[PDB]
Amino acid sequence: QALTARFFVAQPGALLIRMETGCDSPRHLYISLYLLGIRASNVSASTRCLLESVYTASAARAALQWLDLGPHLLHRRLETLGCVKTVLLTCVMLMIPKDMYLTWEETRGRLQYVYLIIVYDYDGPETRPGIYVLTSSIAHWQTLVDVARGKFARERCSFVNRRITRPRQIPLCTGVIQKLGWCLADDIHTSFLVHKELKLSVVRLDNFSVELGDFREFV
Amino acid sequence: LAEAATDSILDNPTTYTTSSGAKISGVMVSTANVMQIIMSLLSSHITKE
Amino acid sequence: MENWSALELLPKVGIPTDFLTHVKTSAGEEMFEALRIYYGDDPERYNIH
Amino acid sequence: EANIFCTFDHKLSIADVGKLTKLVAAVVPIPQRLHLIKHYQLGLHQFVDHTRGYVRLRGLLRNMTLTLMRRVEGNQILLHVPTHGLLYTVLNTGPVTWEKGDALCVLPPLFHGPLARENLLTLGQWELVLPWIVPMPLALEINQRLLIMGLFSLDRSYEEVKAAVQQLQTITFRDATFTIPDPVIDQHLLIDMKTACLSMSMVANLASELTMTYVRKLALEDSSMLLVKCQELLMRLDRPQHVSPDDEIARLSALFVMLRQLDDLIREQVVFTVCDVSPDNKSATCIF
Amino acid sequence: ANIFCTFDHKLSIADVGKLTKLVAAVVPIPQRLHLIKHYQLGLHQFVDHTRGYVRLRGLLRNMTLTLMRRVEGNQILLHVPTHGLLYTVLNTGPVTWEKGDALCVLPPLFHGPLARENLLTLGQWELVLPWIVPMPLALEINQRLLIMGLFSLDRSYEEVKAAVQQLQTITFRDATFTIPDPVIDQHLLIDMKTACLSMSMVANLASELTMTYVRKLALEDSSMLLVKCQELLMRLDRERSPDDEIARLSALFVMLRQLDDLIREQVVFTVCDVSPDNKSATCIFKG
Amino acid sequence: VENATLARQALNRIQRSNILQSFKAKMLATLFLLNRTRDRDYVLKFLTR
Amino acid sequence: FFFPVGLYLPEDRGYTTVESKVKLNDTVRNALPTTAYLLNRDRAVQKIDFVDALKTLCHPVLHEPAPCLQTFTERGPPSEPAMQRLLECRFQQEPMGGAARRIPHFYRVRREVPRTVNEMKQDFVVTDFYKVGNITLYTELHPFFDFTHCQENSETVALCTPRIVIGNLPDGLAPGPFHELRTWEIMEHMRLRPPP
Amino acid sequence: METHLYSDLAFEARFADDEQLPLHLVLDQEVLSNEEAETLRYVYYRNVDSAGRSTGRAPGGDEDDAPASDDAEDAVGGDRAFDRERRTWQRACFRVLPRPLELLDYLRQSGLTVTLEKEQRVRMFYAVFTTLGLRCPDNRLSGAQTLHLRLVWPDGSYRDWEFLARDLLREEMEANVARTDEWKGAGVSRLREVWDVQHRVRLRVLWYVNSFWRSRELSYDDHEVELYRALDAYRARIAVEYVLIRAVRDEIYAVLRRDGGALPQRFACHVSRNMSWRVVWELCRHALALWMDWADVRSCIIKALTPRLSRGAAAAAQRARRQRERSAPKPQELLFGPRNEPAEQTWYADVVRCVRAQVDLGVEVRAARCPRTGLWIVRDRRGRLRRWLSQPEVCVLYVTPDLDFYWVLPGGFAVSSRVTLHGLAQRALRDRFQNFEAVLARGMHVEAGRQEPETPRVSGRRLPF
Amino acid sequence: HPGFALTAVRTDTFEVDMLLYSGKSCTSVIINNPIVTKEERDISTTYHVTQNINTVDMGLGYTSNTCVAYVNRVRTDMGVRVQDLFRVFPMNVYRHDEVDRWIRHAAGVERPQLLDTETISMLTFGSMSERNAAATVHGQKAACELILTPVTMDVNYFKIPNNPRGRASCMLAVDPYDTEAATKAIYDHREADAQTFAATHNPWASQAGCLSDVLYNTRHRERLGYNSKFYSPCAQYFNTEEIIAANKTLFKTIDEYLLRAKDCIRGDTDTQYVCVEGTEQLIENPCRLTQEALPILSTTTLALMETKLKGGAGAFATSETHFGNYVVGEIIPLQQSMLFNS
Amino acid sequence: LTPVTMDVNYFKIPNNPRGRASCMLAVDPYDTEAATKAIYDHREADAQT
Amino acid sequence: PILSTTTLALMETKLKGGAGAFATSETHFGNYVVGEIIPLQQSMLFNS
């Protein structure tokens, strides 16, 4: 059930994320999901080094200019658009790296939803985000935020430690949960991909039905 | 196996009668290989009619 | 909970029978779902309401 | 994938299927979401267990999926999962009067009082217990009131808690009466109160120095009834120098998100919203 | 699921010629009836002297909202959207739309304006449409109205007047608005007053209830989050009967439940490709 | 052909395991036909299969 | 299917119904079984021993007698007053420095002490333990724990105490000759079957 | 480690209105059992001053210098003493780590740093962490102010430990960013064991060097006459049950002197003409002396008096007196009104045996009145009959919930009397064994009178999660 | 060899073709004309077409006799690999952490696992913790065991097909609708059992509250932390409430056998996971109806297995005994001449 | 070879001489991790013995 | 597996064997026999 547009910009499995530019002429920018792999801190350093090696542009330097401009405010600029039918390009309003994908079950529930999970660290100098994507079977939001509070207690401790050690600096949240649609339990498969003659470890989701959610802030 | 089963009471003595007066008194169904073992073992009693 | 009066009053079709075990053994050992074993003679089939 | 079949080990009499055919377009939850199911997981009686917690059932029935019963013809019940958006017709057995604007949320069936507890299908070990469909203000009042039962009653004897919750269990909403029987203090209640404590401490710390003194300024200025209520609620323990616009903007943003993560414990996302109620208050045509 | 609407008064040709410009825009209506008189249509029936804007937001949140489709002789083809399928709208909001945002619906803030809806009026009636603004500007201007109302109780001083004059301005992409005060002549509107009162008193109830409930909670299994919670409370403090606490907690919950037109801004649309002049945009109705 | 294995069916684990068991069984047991047995009915049944 | 491993057969009734068909070496790893040999799906020999059995025998659930103690309190005191006679023992606190002189003051009464249930479990042969003439079959519930009913403050309570040694296993269930056969095994494990 | 930080900060908080110090404690297997510590509900404390016997009562004197005087309806000064003694007990912070651990290695693996004079080995099996408060009334602290400490179990049973202030501070008084991270960084000064008063229980106290109590400049003195007054207070608090026992003993001797000893039969056991009774009389004397020897607080009359002290016994005594003071029934209430209705008694017993010199103290017994006669017949709590009235080598004492009395020699002959608590005051009888009613915590329902689920049971065998 | 001797209990599924025989005109078949149902999909249309069948069995008794005929494929391996008891009770750790790390190192399981909350057991049908290995040359595997007494006479007990718990627990032979006599028959030891006229044959297995009753009873395995997906083959013998529930009349008992008493086991994993709602296969059990189990060919020394494999016809069913060694002779000769005729 | 290795169920049954399974049918298709695990690795057993 | 003794006595008792004696697999004290599963010597040499 395709609902398409045209988006002024090789795999079909990409999530166009519309991030807001601090510069005033574009007012926004369409970054794909793989370039949060370079800002994530849960990821392996080798895959981060590979994506830093392949994708240096002037717009990548402006991307690091305008995402690290305002820290702990990235959820005010985070905005998804759905999946790619073909790559100017189009996007409907699934390729995932191996370490940014995680599951807290035996992933043996038949119908399972997907969920973008981000977290905000504070125990270092300022802020290190960690990008996740959570394939889970829970449908209701409160039970999901209970198991997220159960699985991410150290980030809550870091949140309250930032609120007690830097009183002039105000945080906003500890992260974002947001659904995107569902894949079944059988087409999820550890897999392989080579882009521009490079080895990168990818796990794929095949039968996706796109159905978005909202960026629900939680603690 | 034949004499252990009780006969039914919805009895139709017109249907399922062979030529030369033999009345059918049951059906014995199995797979390919068990039936061909029965045929290769008990071939003397088989009357293909 | 059934209408056994309809079983005892309505006109019936006859059958040749062959039970598996004895009939009273088929009564006391619950082979069917609904049974109405009364000994002697019961006049319960007459109060037509 | 859309129609869910089921079966019983019993057969179905004309009395039982006559009890059941009146329940066309009635809501029945499913724990599993599979194509063919058994009737020993249909409904809710697989999950009911008294002296375990009404709040555990409130957190558990919240997690099941929902279906609508129709087209019964003999060993086929045909639950039908509603698609996201089309107009459906439902039927409620939970005795609450409805309204064209009020949305709906599902609650486990509390006891109503008459010691009827109607189960409408009685088998050898399994009755059929049915989820209540109730309007949104009663759902919010139920959630906030059993959270009051949880949060208020820590470190107290049974006597003053008995005298409080004997009058606090009653909700008189639209000429009815209600009772919240099992508010028992579970680990689920402890993590709910822990999130409530964290959110209350955050909105107590990172709110402004001028929002704390707003009602004090209205006390010094104005006189109303709820102002007298605020003075009796706060007065027992009793020129702006600092101005900062953008810090107040970020402060209200943080106050908003922490109020939202306090409010999430009682406010469920809606499951049905009506377009018409039947005037004898039996069925309704609602969109979800 | 198509709606109709008839006007009782004489309707001219200039009024239709200025109304049919609004061929595809949102018009919220109080009850989903199949035929509705035009007095209920729109938002003119709600505005008055004493009540302000937060009342309009609260009644518009629980109100259903539909789409205007076509015009006829004296029947108006309103059409309620369905969840998931996509439609076209117009832009009555004053901000240029772009791709893929999330539109909100808020009551318009130009009450008694310089545009005056093209003099599309009848006898003691006027049509008015709500703004359709994307979400960051929506909850931004919600915060702006809120802390404009907070400063309103001591405004005799002059630096707070310049602070309010800063708050009255706004910034966006090629967008400057001047959203007027809730205060007019040394008094406040009652729904704005009860909104800021509800949030200030739930803040105070938190400030004098958390110091009880960290001790009434922490005698269970303690955590590092709990000692850091009392650390936060104790830095806040050193910076300086059942019958009462049951009322404190009940008033806590019911007064935080009066901010529900502020704390949750519920998305109603998803933007698709836009038009040149940025007045029209196909979109997906959500919720 | 001893089990339903039409060519569009994709096998799970235990099916392939008993297929391999039967591979080794019918490779060891019936490797050379006419050097082991000179029986009429065995070569008839084998050629029929 | 079911098959036993490691069973010890009685020796006084010992019989060999094969003598010419098989002949073995007299080392006692062959004159006392400890493992079993079975058949696979294909007809092949395979070993089942205690080495694979530590995936079940070394579990924390095997060593908890609290369900056994709860069900022994549930099905609690015995039936007959004829079996109230063998079930009295006391766990008190006596100052032992006084007891070192009070030992002749204990025997100055002339009333007999009844034997407890553990003494009642060793006056049976290995083939009479499994008959209805035996009394203590309602007590032998676990190979790691001894059970009894003993009156503390004059009420019969159930109590489980772990047999910390395997020597505390009763001789109807682990007899003397089996123990000496285990010693012959443990001497052959250290290459000492001729003793010095 | 965790609850020490919280309670230390909370005692920084509440120092303005209640002036106590943070006395952090840990305990071990030398005090409470693993089955007893796995299910431990909540700990309690209330410290006794040198001249005043509590804190929650009035500062100078009290009303508790009046005796109960063997009243019937008001058991011990009514029920105001119940809420008064409940008001003086405070609830303390609490945690149990139910797994084997080395304290120095556990605090080293956690955030703290140990700086001891020497690294001795404390091998303990499970650690329960709690903080109590010794109260400084002025800046001055008294060396005879003792600190009591309860351990409350979910059934309602409790043990009682208490200890003075000389053994808590025998050395640590004679040796004189955020808060949490510096508390973690500097940490614990040292560790020493503290004993109770009766040298029974060895538990350990933890002295943290980042305690704010070091910054209050507390003064201290331990005089001899204050320690002697604390010795007399402890003498009374130990002598309460024992003077009740002596009142029972001279009650039995006086009621034997009164009627001479030609005492009737009050229990249902047969007798034979031929058997001599000089032997059973000498056995009665020897066994009463033996019961005088092995007298203990865990006995029949004390556990019979424990549910007497609460408010429910006062309400049941009022309604039972109103029911037993009721006139002859009239036909007007018999014919139309609600009709009226004490099935079988709930006693306690001490059974003493002369030939084996073993008394058995805590016994429950359900008595019954035999229908054929006016005699008493005892039965077990399960339902079997009690055959100790056959044995000529035994004796048995009895006590009613009416607090009547039966001392029964072999043959069912009972020396009847009543208990005497005229010679005892109120405050010791309350604060020794006042029956405590449970407060709401995890695992229990809101309204009273409900079926209870399983305990929370913070477990040492299961994964605790 | 320690001071106890295990009896092992395993299950063994099969692929079997059973023939059937029914009398003439036994069950009338009632069919109808089919109905079509249109459904609107995105581009194309599916036409659901149904047809109903009613079947009136017109014999008094059972009119159709079937017989298990010919085994061809053995689905499991008939192996010896031990039931992974660490995965079925994932909660229970030892008290001391070092002895638990040392036991998990000396065993195979790498860590204690945390079993999920009950809502995930509602949404997902179960846990299924054990991961399938890379070797599947034998099939799926299961073998569990019962700790017994090492004196236990096999001659009365392990040669003939018998109950592995010691007491006869077949409620066909007891009075129907009598719970007290059933509990007196299968639990009381002041009177002998029915199979052999002795008390028991393994007193750690029969008593209500033994280790077998706290390791296998599904009424009593819920208290300690257990997993509902691993199929214990002894659970058909130790589930006491499931056994006393079948204490009925023999015709309703045989209808329970031919209708209800068929388990399902999932057929794509190498560990026997409990299938939920079998709609593609069904595992019928005669060894739950008869409440016994059959002895498999086991020896103790190699050379006695060699003299079994050296013999021919009529060799797998004898039962020889050396001095301390033994061989239990199987009663069903399926190891001898099922794969021999292949 | 190593001179200890058992022969009673290894050397007299059809078997692979490398020691392990190496059958390549019992593994899942197109899963090289489980392939190289079950041919080479030694934290697990073969499907044969 | 093919026929492989380790002492000549087992080869002699298999060369004196009439029919099917090649199928067995016998073991002495440390001296063994691998028995064939394909009866190859009997078949191919009985065909001569």
Numbering used by the authors:
A (entry chain g): 44 to 52, 61 to 138, 145 to 150, 165 to 290
B (entry chain a): 246 to 294
C (entry chain B): 1 to 49
D (entry chain h): 5 to 242, 255 to 304
E (entry chain I): 6 to 245, 260 to 306
F (entry chain B): 197 to 245
G (entry chain a): 393 to 588
H (entry chain M): 1 to 176, 300 to 464, 468 to 591
Give the original sentences from the paper that presented this experimental model.
Here we present high-resolution structures of the A- and B-capsids and in-situ portals of human cytomegalovirus. The portal proteins are believed to orchestrate nucleation of the procapsid through the formation of a portal–scaffold complex, which facilitates procapsid assembly.
Based on the high-resolution C5 reconstruction of the portal vertices of the A- and B-capsids, we built the Cα model for the portal turret. The five-fold symmetrical 10-helix anchor in the DNA-devoid capsids was located beneath the floor region of the capsid, sticking to the P1 and P6 MCPs; this is similar to that observed in the virion capsid. Five sets of two β-hairpins from the trunk domains of one Tri1 molecule and one Tri2B molecule interact with the two long helices of the portal turret at the upper region; five sets of the long helix, a short helix of P6, and two β-sheets in the floor regions of P1 and P6 make close contact with the two long helices of the portal turret at the lower regions. We believe that, in addition to the 10-helix anchor, the conformation transition of the portal turret from a C-5 symmetry to a C-6 symmetry, which has only been observed in HCMV to date, would require immense inner pressure to occur, and this transition, in turn, contributes significantly to packaging HCMV DNA, the largest genome among human herpesviruses.
